[PDB]
């Protein structure tokens with residue numbers, strides 16, 4: 001293996017259901033891409049408080065959408081971890097470019 005990635009890259013739809021789930025995201029969660037595509041990212045990987053605020057962002061972003069950055073406490077195999085996500089359209093899908101800033 002010649003190289004690795006430094007960012008958790010998850011692609012979502014307006015409902016928050018996962019479409020792509022890169023390799024670093026699997027290592028953080030123990031769940032492979034095949035398991036989580038079609039699954040809701042909010043209920044899977046964040047608490048109710050974070051899920052609430054995030055789900056409104058994604059829904060609001062798909063209405064009047066401008067690229068933005070967000071800090072979201074994510075729920076991983078080693079407890080919660082804070083990620084900076086750079087979010088933007090590809091318009092059906094939302095690319096989430098995350099960095100563990102814990």
Ligand SMILES: CCCCCCCCC/C=C\C(=O)O
Nearest residue numbers: 010045054057058070085096
């Ligand atoms: C362990 C996988 C974590 C992927 C979670 C995606 C978070 C993307 C954040 C999107 C909208 C927001 O909250 O403003």
